[PDB]
């Protein structure tokens, strides 16, 4: 089990990932299940389908429901405070 | 992080629904339902959310879902003894 900090530059107008999961559901932490061609995640190259997102900009997603985890990721992508998102991901 | 759990064959069925296997969203079989009355329910140490890594020492890592299910079913069908051993993990 390896945790990797992946910096995704906001290179495109969209993030372009589909996430599945959150607390109290079958997949307990958000897992990347789709990466859309052309989006910021696809340009990164270090994000992969199957990666489980543990943290977003240092904010843990452990124990968060899906709606809240998606809100945190969407806010991190939208904010003009920085031109990137740090994801801490794992691949077990 | 990984725990050995011995499930006694206290009922005619194992009584679990599993989801997962290689090359799918959930890469290893995860227990998503435990049926009331089955062997898993009587165990008390198996939980929904547990991911099965091994069955009687046989790794499930890298196996596709149908093969992982076949291995578990075959292990449960044993007549030589009255239990099955799972190596499980939770996260």
């Amino acid at each position: 089990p390896t945790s990797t900090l992946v910096r995704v530059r906001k290179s495109a107008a969209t993030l372009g990932i589909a996430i599945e999961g959150g607390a109290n559901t079958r997949q307990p932490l958000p897992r990347i299940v789709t990466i859309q061609r052309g989006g910021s995640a696809h340009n990164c190259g270090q994000l992969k389908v199957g990666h489980v997102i543990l943290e977003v900009n240092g904010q843990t997603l452990r124990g968060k429901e899906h709606k809240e985890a998606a809100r945190i990721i969407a806010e991190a992508f939208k904010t003009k405070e920085r031109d990137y998102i740090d994801f801490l991901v794992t691949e077990f | 992080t990984s725990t050995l759990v011995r499930v006694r064959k206290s009922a005619a069925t194992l009584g679990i629904a599993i989801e997962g296997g290689a090359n799918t969203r959930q890469p290893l079989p995860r227990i998503v339902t435990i049926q009331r009355g089955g062997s898993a329910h009587n165990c008390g140490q198996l939980k929904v959310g547990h991911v099965i890594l091994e069955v009687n020492g046989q790794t499930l890592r890298g196996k596709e879902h149908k093969e992982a299910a076949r291995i578990i079913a075959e292990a449960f069908k044993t007549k030589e003894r009255d239990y099955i051993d799972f190596l499980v993990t939770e996260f």
Binding site: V33, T34, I35, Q36, R37, H42, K48, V49, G50 | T13, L14, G15, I16, A17, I18, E19, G20, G21, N23, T24, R25, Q26, V32, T33, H65, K66, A69, I72, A73, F76
Partner: peptide, 13 residues
Amino acid sequence: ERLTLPPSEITLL
């Protein structure tokens, strides 16, 4: 590279 993972299969045991 693989850009999607399909829903997992399910079995009742």
